[PDB]
mmCIF file of all heavy atoms in Angstrom:
data_model
loop_
_atom_site.group_PDB
_atom_site.id
_atom_site.type_symbol
_atom_site.label_atom_id
_atom_site.label_comp_id
_atom_site.label_asym_id
_atom_site.label_seq_id
_atom_site.Cartn_x
_atom_site.Cartn_y
_atom_site.Cartn_z
ATOM 1 N N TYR A 1 19.292 13.219 1.675
ATOM 2 C CA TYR A 1 19.460 14.232 0.644
ATOM 3 C C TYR A 1 18.747 15.528 1.001
ATOM 4 O O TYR A 1 17.676 15.514 1.608
ATOM 5 C CB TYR A 1 18.937 13.714 -0.704
ATOM 6 C CG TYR A 1 19.722 12.555 -1.282
ATOM 7 C CD1 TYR A 1 19.608 11.278 -0.747
ATOM 8 C CD2 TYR A 1 20.568 12.736 -2.371
ATOM 9 C CE1 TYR A 1 20.324 10.218 -1.269
ATOM 10 C CE2 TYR A 1 21.287 11.678 -2.902
ATOM 11 C CZ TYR A 1 21.160 10.422 -2.347
ATOM 12 O OH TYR A 1 21.869 9.363 -2.867
ATOM 13 N N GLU A 2 19.352 16.649 0.626
ATOM 14 C CA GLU A 2 18.646 17.920 0.617
ATOM 15 C C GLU A 2 17.669 17.887 -0.550
ATOM 16 O O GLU A 2 18.042 17.520 -1.663
ATOM 17 C CB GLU A 2 19.617 19.096 0.486
ATOM 18 C CG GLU A 2 18.948 20.464 0.471
ATOM 19 C CD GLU A 2 19.938 21.601 0.259
ATOM 20 O OE1 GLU A 2 21.159 21.351 0.335
ATOM 21 O OE2 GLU A 2 19.495 22.745 0.017
ATOM 22 N N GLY A 3 16.417 18.247 -0.295
ATOM 23 C CA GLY A 3 15.404 18.196 -1.329
ATOM 24 C C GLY A 3 14.518 19.422 -1.339
ATOM 25 O O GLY A 3 14.579 20.255 -0.434
ATOM 26 N N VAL A 4 13.688 19.529 -2.371
ATOM 27 C CA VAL A 4 12.764 20.644 -2.493
ATOM 28 C C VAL A 4 11.328 20.153 -2.619
ATOM 29 O O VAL A 4 10.986 19.445 -3.565
ATOM 30 C CB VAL A 4 13.102 21.530 -3.714
ATOM 31 C CG1 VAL A 4 12.066 22.629 -3.879
ATOM 32 C CG2 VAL A 4 14.495 22.121 -3.576
ATOM 33 N N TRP A 5 10.494 20.519 -1.653
ATOM 34 C CA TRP A 5 9.062 20.294 -1.769
ATOM 35 C C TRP A 5 8.495 21.388 -2.674
ATOM 36 O O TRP A 5 8.180 22.484 -2.213
ATOM 37 C CB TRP A 5 8.391 20.298 -0.396
ATOM 38 C CG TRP A 5 7.035 19.665 -0.393
ATOM 39 C CD1 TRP A 5 6.297 19.302 -1.483
ATOM 40 C CD2 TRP A 5 6.259 19.302 0.755
ATOM 41 N NE1 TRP A 5 5.107 18.745 -1.084
ATOM 42 C CE2 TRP A 5 5.059 18.732 0.285
ATOM 43 C CE3 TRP A 5 6.461 19.407 2.135
ATOM 44 C CZ2 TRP A 5 4.065 18.268 1.145
ATOM 45 C CZ3 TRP A 5 5.472 18.945 2.988
ATOM 46 C CH2 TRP A 5 4.291 18.384 2.490
ATOM 47 N N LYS A 6 8.375 21.070 -3.960
ATOM 48 C CA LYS A 6 8.175 22.064 -5.018
ATOM 49 C C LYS A 6 7.017 23.032 -4.811
ATOM 50 O O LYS A 6 7.185 24.240 -4.970
ATOM 51 C CB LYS A 6 7.993 21.352 -6.355
ATOM 52 C CG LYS A 6 9.284 20.808 -6.916
ATOM 53 C CD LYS A 6 9.040 19.963 -8.142
ATOM 54 C CE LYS A 6 8.692 18.546 -7.765
ATOM 55 N NZ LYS A 6 8.500 17.708 -8.977
ATOM 56 N N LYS A 7 5.851 22.502 -4.460
ATOM 57 C CA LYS A 7 4.651 23.319 -4.322
ATOM 58 C C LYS A 7 4.773 24.371 -3.220
ATOM 59 O O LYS A 7 4.050 25.368 -3.227
ATOM 60 C CB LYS A 7 3.438 22.426 -4.059
ATOM 61 C CG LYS A 7 3.644 21.440 -2.932
ATOM 62 C CD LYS A 7 2.584 20.353 -2.947
ATOM 63 C CE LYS A 7 1.318 20.801 -2.242
ATOM 64 N NZ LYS A 7 0.491 19.634 -1.823
ATOM 65 N N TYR A 8 5.693 24.153 -2.284
ATOM 66 C CA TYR A 8 5.875 25.070 -1.165
ATOM 67 C C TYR A 8 7.194 25.830 -1.232
ATOM 68 O O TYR A 8 7.474 26.659 -0.363
ATOM 69 C CB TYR A 8 5.801 24.315 0.163
ATOM 70 C CG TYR A 8 4.449 23.713 0.464
ATOM 71 C CD1 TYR A 8 4.283 22.337 0.543
ATOM 72 C CD2 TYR A 8 3.341 24.521 0.687
ATOM 73 C CE1 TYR A 8 3.049 21.782 0.824
ATOM 74 C CE2 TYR A 8 2.104 23.975 0.968
ATOM 75 C CZ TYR A 8 1.964 22.606 1.036
ATOM 76 O OH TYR A 8 0.733 22.059 1.317
ATOM 77 N N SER A 9 7.999 25.542 -2.254
ATOM 78 C CA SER A 9 9.349 26.099 -2.367
ATOM 79 C C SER A 9 10.149 25.831 -1.095
ATOM 80 O O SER A 9 10.959 26.658 -0.672
ATOM 81 C CB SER A 9 9.302 27.604 -2.651
ATOM 82 O OG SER A 9 8.620 27.879 -3.862
ATOM 83 N N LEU A 10 9.915 24.668 -0.493
ATOM 84 C CA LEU A 10 10.459 24.357 0.822
ATOM 85 C C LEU A 10 11.606 23.359 0.769
ATOM 86 O O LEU A 10 11.458 22.247 0.258
ATOM 87 C CB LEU A 10 9.355 23.812 1.729
ATOM 88 C CG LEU A 10 9.778 23.398 3.138
ATOM 89 C CD1 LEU A 10 10.365 24.583 3.893
ATOM 90 C CD2 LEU A 10 8.598 22.805 3.887
ATOM 91 N N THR A 11 12.749 23.761 1.308
ATOM 92 C CA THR A 11 13.875 22.852 1.440
ATOM 93 C C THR A 11 13.564 21.804 2.504
ATOM 94 O O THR A 11 13.160 22.133 3.621
ATOM 95 C CB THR A 11 15.169 23.599 1.797
ATOM 96 O OG1 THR A 11 15.519 24.477 0.721
ATOM 97 C CG2 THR A 11 16.306 22.613 2.028
ATOM 98 N N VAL A 12 13.730 20.538 2.141
ATOM 99 C CA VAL A 12 13.438 19.435 3.046
ATOM 100 C C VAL A 12 14.585 18.436 3.040
ATOM 101 O O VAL A 12 15.471 18.505 2.188
ATOM 102 C CB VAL A 12 12.128 18.716 2.660
ATOM 103 C CG1 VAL A 12 10.939 19.653 2.809
ATOM 104 C CG2 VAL A 12 12.212 18.185 1.236
ATOM 105 N N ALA A 13 14.574 17.518 4.000
ATOM 106 C CA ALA A 13 15.531 16.419 4.011
ATOM 107 C C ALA A 13 14.829 15.138 3.586
ATOM 108 O O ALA A 13 13.759 14.807 4.096
ATOM 109 C CB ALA A 13 16.161 16.259 5.385
ATOM 110 N N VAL A 14 15.431 14.425 2.642
ATOM 111 C CA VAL A 14 14.827 13.217 2.100
ATOM 112 C C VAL A 14 15.708 11.999 2.345
ATOM 113 O O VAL A 14 16.841 11.935 1.866
ATOM 114 C CB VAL A 14 14.563 13.352 0.585
ATOM 115 C CG1 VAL A 14 13.869 12.105 0.051
ATOM 116 C CG2 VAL A 14 13.732 14.592 0.300
ATOM 117 N N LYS A 15 15.185 11.038 3.100
ATOM 118 C CA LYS A 15 15.884 9.778 3.317
ATOM 119 C C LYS A 15 15.427 8.755 2.283
ATOM 120 O O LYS A 15 14.230 8.599 2.043
ATOM 121 C CB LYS A 15 15.639 9.245 4.730
ATOM 122 C CG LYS A 15 16.564 8.096 5.122
ATOM 123 C CD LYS A 15 15.994 7.259 6.261
ATOM 124 C CE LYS A 15 15.733 8.091 7.501
ATOM 125 N N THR A 16 16.383 8.068 1.668
ATOM 126 C CA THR A 16 16.068 7.059 0.662
ATOM 127 C C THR A 16 16.666 5.706 1.021
ATOM 128 O O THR A 16 17.564 5.611 1.857
ATOM 129 C CB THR A 16 16.576 7.465 -0.737
ATOM 130 O OG1 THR A 16 18.008 7.518 -0.733
ATOM 131 C CG2 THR A 16 16.028 8.820 -1.131
ATOM 132 N N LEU A 17 16.161 4.663 0.373
ATOM 133 C CA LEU A 17 16.619 3.304 0.611
ATOM 134 C C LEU A 17 17.283 2.737 -0.640
ATOM 135 O O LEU A 17 16.638 2.581 -1.677
ATOM 136 C CB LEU A 17 15.446 2.422 1.039
ATOM 137 C CG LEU A 17 15.785 1.043 1.600
ATOM 138 C CD1 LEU A 17 16.563 1.187 2.890
ATOM 139 C CD2 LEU A 17 14.514 0.242 1.821
ATOM 140 N N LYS A 18 18.573 2.430 -0.538
ATOM 141 C CA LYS A 18 19.334 1.947 -1.686
ATOM 142 C C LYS A 18 19.275 0.426 -1.821
ATOM 143 O O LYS A 18 18.210 -0.181 -1.697
ATOM 144 C CB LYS A 18 20.791 2.404 -1.589
ATOM 145 N N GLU A 19 20.427 -0.182 -2.081
ATOM 146 C CA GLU A 19 20.497 -1.621 -2.299
ATOM 147 C C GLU A 19 20.631 -2.365 -0.980
ATOM 148 O O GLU A 19 19.841 -3.259 -0.677
ATOM 149 C CB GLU A 19 21.666 -1.968 -3.222
ATOM 150 N N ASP A 20 21.628 -1.983 -0.190
ATOM 151 C CA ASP A 20 21.893 -2.665 1.069
ATOM 152 C C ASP A 20 22.087 -1.683 2.218
ATOM 153 O O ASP A 20 22.862 -1.941 3.138
ATOM 154 C CB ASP A 20 23.124 -3.565 0.934
ATOM 155 N N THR A 21 21.379 -0.558 2.159
ATOM 156 C CA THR A 21 21.447 0.443 3.217
ATOM 157 C C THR A 21 20.879 -0.122 4.519
ATOM 158 O O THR A 21 21.593 -0.260 5.512
ATOM 159 C CB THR A 21 20.686 1.727 2.835
ATOM 160 O OG1 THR A 21 21.316 2.338 1.702
ATOM 161 C CG2 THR A 21 20.693 2.712 3.991
ATOM 162 N N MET A 22 19.590 -0.446 4.503
ATOM 163 C CA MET A 22 18.943 -1.112 5.627
ATOM 164 C C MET A 22 17.786 -1.945 5.093
ATOM 165 O O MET A 22 17.379 -1.776 3.945
ATOM 166 C CB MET A 22 18.457 -0.098 6.670
ATOM 167 C CG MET A 22 17.094 0.511 6.375
ATOM 168 S SD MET A 22 16.691 1.910 7.445
ATOM 169 C CE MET A 22 16.725 1.132 9.055
ATOM 170 N N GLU A 23 17.261 -2.849 5.914
ATOM 171 C CA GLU A 23 16.156 -3.699 5.481
ATOM 172 C C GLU A 23 14.886 -2.873 5.281
ATOM 173 O O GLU A 23 14.650 -1.904 6.002
ATOM 174 C CB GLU A 23 15.921 -4.823 6.490
ATOM 175 C CG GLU A 23 17.126 -5.735 6.672
ATOM 176 C CD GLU A 23 17.643 -6.296 5.357
ATOM 177 O OE1 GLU A 23 16.816 -6.730 4.525
ATOM 178 O OE2 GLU A 23 18.876 -6.294 5.150
ATOM 179 N N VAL A 24 14.081 -3.262 4.296
ATOM 180 C CA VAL A 24 12.903 -2.492 3.900
ATOM 181 C C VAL A 24 11.909 -2.299 5.043
ATOM 182 O O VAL A 24 11.395 -1.198 5.248
ATOM 183 C CB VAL A 24 12.166 -3.161 2.716
ATOM 184 C CG1 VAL A 24 10.907 -2.382 2.358
ATOM 185 C CG2 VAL A 24 13.084 -3.273 1.508
ATOM 186 N N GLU A 25 11.645 -3.368 5.785
ATOM 187 C CA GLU A 25 10.654 -3.323 6.853
ATOM 188 C C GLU A 25 11.108 -2.442 8.017
ATOM 189 O O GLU A 25 10.286 -1.859 8.721
ATOM 190 C CB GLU A 25 10.342 -4.738 7.343
ATOM 191 C CG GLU A 25 9.795 -5.658 6.259
ATOM 192 C CD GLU A 25 8.419 -5.242 5.765
ATOM 193 O OE1 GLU A 25 7.750 -4.446 6.455
ATOM 194 O OE2 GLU A 25 8.000 -5.722 4.690
ATOM 195 N N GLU A 26 12.418 -2.347 8.213
ATOM 196 C CA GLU A 26 12.969 -1.438 9.208
ATOM 197 C C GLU A 26 12.770 0.009 8.771
ATOM 198 O O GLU A 26 12.349 0.853 9.559
ATOM 199 C CB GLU A 26 14.453 -1.718 9.437
ATOM 200 C CG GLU A 26 14.732 -2.945 10.277
ATOM 201 C CD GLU A 26 16.215 -3.235 10.398
ATOM 202 O OE1 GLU A 26 16.926 -3.135 9.376
ATOM 203 O OE2 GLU A 26 16.671 -3.556 11.515
ATOM 204 N N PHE A 27 13.081 0.281 7.508
ATOM 205 C CA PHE A 27 12.894 1.605 6.924
ATOM 206 C C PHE A 27 11.438 2.045 7.040
ATOM 207 O O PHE A 27 11.151 3.189 7.389
ATOM 208 C CB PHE A 27 13.335 1.603 5.457
ATOM 209 C CG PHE A 27 13.289 2.955 4.798
ATOM 210 C CD1 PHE A 27 14.414 3.761 4.762
ATOM 211 C CD2 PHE A 27 12.128 3.409 4.191
ATOM 212 C CE1 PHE A 27 14.377 5.000 4.147
ATOM 213 C CE2 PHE A 27 12.087 4.648 3.580
ATOM 214 C CZ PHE A 27 13.212 5.443 3.557
ATOM 215 N N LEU A 28 10.523 1.125 6.752
ATOM 216 C CA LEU A 28 9.099 1.423 6.797
ATOM 217 C C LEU A 28 8.605 1.632 8.228
ATOM 218 O O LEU A 28 7.670 2.399 8.458
ATOM 219 C CB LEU A 28 8.302 0.307 6.118
ATOM 220 C CG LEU A 28 8.458 0.196 4.597
ATOM 221 C CD1 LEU A 28 7.750 -1.044 4.060
ATOM 222 C CD2 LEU A 28 7.940 1.449 3.907
ATOM 223 N N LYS A 29 9.229 0.955 9.190
ATOM 224 C CA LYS A 29 8.842 1.123 10.588
ATOM 225 C C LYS A 29 9.328 2.464 11.142
ATOM 226 O O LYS A 29 8.658 3.077 11.974
ATOM 227 C CB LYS A 29 9.375 -0.022 11.452
ATOM 228 C CG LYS A 29 8.963 0.104 12.911
ATOM 229 C CD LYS A 29 9.317 -1.118 13.729
ATOM 230 C CE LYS A 29 8.831 -0.960 15.160
ATOM 231 N NZ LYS A 29 9.000 -2.210 15.949
ATOM 232 N N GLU A 30 10.494 2.909 10.681
ATOM 233 C CA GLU A 30 10.996 4.237 11.027
ATOM 234 C C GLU A 30 9.985 5.312 10.654
ATOM 235 O O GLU A 30 9.720 6.226 11.430
ATOM 236 C CB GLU A 30 12.324 4.524 10.324
ATOM 237 C CG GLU A 30 13.490 3.704 10.828
ATOM 238 C CD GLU A 30 14.827 4.263 10.379
ATOM 239 O OE1 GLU A 30 14.835 5.241 9.599
ATOM 240 O OE2 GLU A 30 15.869 3.735 10.822
ATOM 241 N N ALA A 31 9.422 5.190 9.457
ATOM 242 C CA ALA A 31 8.434 6.143 8.973
ATOM 243 C C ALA A 31 7.165 6.107 9.820
ATOM 244 O O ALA A 31 6.546 7.141 10.065
ATOM 245 C CB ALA A 31 8.104 5.864 7.513
ATOM 246 N N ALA A 32 6.786 4.913 10.266
ATOM 247 C CA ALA A 32 5.558 4.733 11.035
ATOM 248 C C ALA A 32 5.677 5.329 12.434
ATOM 249 O O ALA A 32 4.745 5.961 12.928
ATOM 250 C CB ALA A 32 5.198 3.253 11.119
ATOM 251 N N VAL A 33 6.826 5.121 13.066
ATOM 252 C CA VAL A 33 7.064 5.635 14.410
ATOM 253 C C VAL A 33 7.074 7.164 14.430
ATOM 254 O O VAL A 33 6.496 7.786 15.321
ATOM 255 C CB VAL A 33 8.395 5.098 14.982
ATOM 256 C CG1 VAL A 33 8.775 5.838 16.256
ATOM 257 C CG2 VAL A 33 8.289 3.597 15.241
ATOM 258 N N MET A 34 7.711 7.765 13.432
ATOM 259 C CA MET A 34 7.833 9.217 13.369
ATOM 260 C C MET A 34 6.490 9.923 13.194
ATOM 261 O O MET A 34 6.347 11.085 13.568
ATOM 262 C CB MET A 34 8.778 9.613 12.239
ATOM 263 C CG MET A 34 10.222 9.223 12.501
ATOM 264 S SD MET A 34 11.342 10.019 11.348
ATOM 265 C CE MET A 34 10.980 11.743 11.676
ATOM 266 N N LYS A 35 5.512 9.217 12.633
ATOM 267 C CA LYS A 35 4.165 9.756 12.482
ATOM 268 C C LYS A 35 3.534 10.090 13.834
ATOM 269 O O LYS A 35 2.649 10.941 13.920
ATOM 270 C CB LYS A 35 3.273 8.769 11.728
ATOM 271 C CG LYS A 35 3.624 8.592 10.259
ATOM 272 C CD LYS A 35 2.876 7.409 9.660
ATOM 273 C CE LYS A 35 3.199 7.235 8.188
ATOM 274 N NZ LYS A 35 2.648 5.959 7.653
ATOM 275 N N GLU A 36 3.996 9.417 14.885
ATOM 276 C CA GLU A 36 3.438 9.595 16.223
ATOM 277 C C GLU A 36 4.193 10.654 17.019
ATOM 278 O O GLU A 36 3.713 11.130 18.045
ATOM 279 C CB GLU A 36 3.458 8.269 16.986
ATOM 280 C CG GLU A 36 3.026 7.073 16.155
ATOM 281 C CD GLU A 36 3.098 5.770 16.925
ATOM 282 O OE1 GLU A 36 3.509 5.793 18.106
ATOM 283 O OE2 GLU A 36 2.752 4.720 16.346
ATOM 284 N N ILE A 37 5.377 11.016 16.538
ATOM 285 C CA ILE A 37 6.250 11.937 17.254
ATOM 286 C C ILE A 37 5.965 13.397 16.910
ATOM 287 O O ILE A 37 6.068 13.799 15.751
ATOM 288 C CB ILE A 37 7.733 11.637 16.953
ATOM 289 C CG1 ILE A 37 8.072 10.187 17.310
ATOM 290 C CG2 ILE A 37 8.633 12.605 17.695
ATOM 291 C CD1 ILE A 37 7.898 9.860 18.772
ATOM 292 N N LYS A 38 5.609 14.186 17.920
ATOM 293 C CA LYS A 38 5.422 15.623 17.736
ATOM 294 C C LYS A 38 5.953 16.423 18.919
ATOM 295 O O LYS A 38 5.387 16.395 20.012
ATOM 296 C CB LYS A 38 3.950 15.959 17.510
ATOM 297 C CG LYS A 38 3.686 16.578 16.150
ATOM 298 C CD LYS A 38 2.814 17.815 16.253
ATOM 299 C CE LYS A 38 2.752 18.541 14.918
ATOM 300 N NZ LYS A 38 2.089 19.869 15.029
ATOM 301 N N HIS A 39 7.040 17.148 18.678
ATOM 302 C CA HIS A 39 7.704 17.932 19.708
ATOM 303 C C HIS A 39 8.586 18.963 19.017
ATOM 304 O O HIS A 39 9.211 18.658 18.001
ATOM 305 C CB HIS A 39 8.527 17.029 20.636
ATOM 306 C CG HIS A 39 9.048 17.724 21.856
ATOM 307 N ND1 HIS A 39 10.244 18.409 21.870
ATOM 308 C CD2 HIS A 39 8.533 17.842 23.103
ATOM 309 C CE1 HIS A 39 10.443 18.918 23.073
ATOM 310 N NE2 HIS A 39 9.420 18.588 23.840
ATOM 311 N N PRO A 40 8.623 20.195 19.549
ATOM 312 C CA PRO A 40 9.377 21.280 18.907
ATOM 313 C C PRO A 40 10.879 21.006 18.801
ATOM 314 O O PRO A 40 11.554 21.628 17.984
ATOM 315 C CB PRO A 40 9.103 22.491 19.816
ATOM 316 C CG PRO A 40 8.587 21.926 21.095
ATOM 317 C CD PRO A 40 7.875 20.662 20.728
ATOM 318 N N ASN A 41 11.389 20.078 19.601
ATOM 319 C CA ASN A 41 12.812 19.774 19.582
ATOM 320 C C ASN A 41 13.111 18.358 19.083
ATOM 321 O O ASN A 41 14.172 17.800 19.358
ATOM 322 C CB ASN A 41 13.399 19.998 20.976
ATOM 323 C CG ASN A 41 13.260 21.443 21.432
ATOM 324 O OD1 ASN A 41 12.503 21.746 22.353
ATOM 325 N ND2 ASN A 41 13.986 22.341 20.778
ATOM 326 N N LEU A 42 12.165 17.790 18.341
ATOM 327 C CA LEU A 42 12.383 16.535 17.630
ATOM 328 C C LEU A 42 12.103 16.753 16.145
ATOM 329 O O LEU A 42 11.100 17.370 15.786
ATOM 330 C CB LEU A 42 11.497 15.425 18.198
ATOM 331 C CG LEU A 42 11.878 14.939 19.602
ATOM 332 C CD1 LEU A 42 10.786 14.069 20.200
ATOM 333 C CD2 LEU A 42 13.200 14.188 19.572
ATOM 334 N N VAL A 43 13.001 16.266 15.292
ATOM 335 C CA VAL A 43 12.879 16.456 13.850
ATOM 336 C C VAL A 43 11.504 16.009 13.355
ATOM 337 O O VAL A 43 11.114 14.853 13.518
ATOM 338 C CB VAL A 43 13.979 15.694 13.088
ATOM 339 C CG1 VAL A 43 13.846 15.928 11.586
ATOM 340 C CG2 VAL A 43 15.354 16.126 13.582
ATOM 341 N N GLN A 44 10.764 16.944 12.771
ATOM 342 C CA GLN A 44 9.374 16.695 12.409
ATOM 343 C C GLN A 44 9.243 16.005 11.055
ATOM 344 O O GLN A 44 9.836 16.433 10.065
ATOM 345 C CB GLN A 44 8.585 18.008 12.407
ATOM 346 C CG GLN A 44 7.116 17.852 12.035
ATOM 347 C CD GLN A 44 6.384 16.876 12.939
ATOM 348 O OE1 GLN A 44 6.536 16.908 14.160
ATOM 349 N NE2 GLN A 44 5.590 15.995 12.339
ATOM 350 N N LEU A 45 8.470 14.926 11.027
ATOM 351 C CA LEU A 45 8.120 14.265 9.779
ATOM 352 C C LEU A 45 7.192 15.162 8.964
ATOM 353 O O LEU A 45 6.312 15.815 9.521
ATOM 354 C CB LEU A 45 7.455 12.916 10.054
ATOM 355 C CG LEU A 45 7.091 12.064 8.839
ATOM 356 C CD1 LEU A 45 8.346 11.576 8.131
ATOM 357 C CD2 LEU A 45 6.220 10.898 9.258
ATOM 358 N N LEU A 46 7.398 15.201 7.651
ATOM 359 C CA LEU A 46 6.555 16.005 6.771
ATOM 360 C C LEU A 46 5.716 15.124 5.848
ATOM 361 O O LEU A 46 4.589 15.473 5.498
ATOM 362 C CB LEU A 46 7.407 16.972 5.943
ATOM 363 C CG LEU A 46 8.157 18.054 6.723
ATOM 364 C CD1 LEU A 46 8.950 18.954 5.786
ATOM 365 C CD2 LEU A 46 7.191 18.874 7.568
ATOM 366 N N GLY A 47 6.271 13.984 5.456
ATOM 367 C CA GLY A 47 5.566 13.060 4.588
ATOM 368 C C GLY A 47 6.394 11.839 4.251
ATOM 369 O O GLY A 47 7.585 11.780 4.562
ATOM 370 N N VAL A 48 5.760 10.856 3.621
ATOM 371 C CA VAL A 48 6.452 9.646 3.195
ATOM 372 C C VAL A 48 6.022 9.231 1.793
ATOM 373 O O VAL A 48 4.939 9.588 1.330
ATOM 374 C CB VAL A 48 6.195 8.464 4.160
ATOM 375 C CG1 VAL A 48 6.757 8.757 5.549
ATOM 376 C CG2 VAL A 48 4.709 8.148 4.234
#
């Protein structure tokens, strides 16, 4: 989803987990891996 980080007036992308989108532990591991990734040409994590 396109989202708004209100305090910064910043448009962000928000990934969510529905009913049968993907398994919870996989979703949570995606978030964990991205915390380690920092590069100007890789989509930057902002928060979870």
Side-chain angles (χ1 to χ4, degrees), residues 1-14 16-17 21-48:
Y1 294 74
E2 180 183 349
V4 176
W5 198 349
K6 285 173 276 182
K7 51 195 276 200
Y8 295 115
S9 300
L10 178 60
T11 296
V12 296
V14 183
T16 65
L17 192 64
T21 296
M22 84 191 299
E23 300 307 316
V24 177
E25 300 293 343
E26 284 176 317
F27 185 94
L28 291 173
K29 181 172 182 173
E30 291 195 355
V33 169
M34 292 193 59
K35 291 169 179 171
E36 317 178 359
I37 303 298
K38 243 227 171 189
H39 190 273
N41 299 111
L42 290 168
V43 181
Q44 180 57 45
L45 183 68
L46 295 181
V48 296

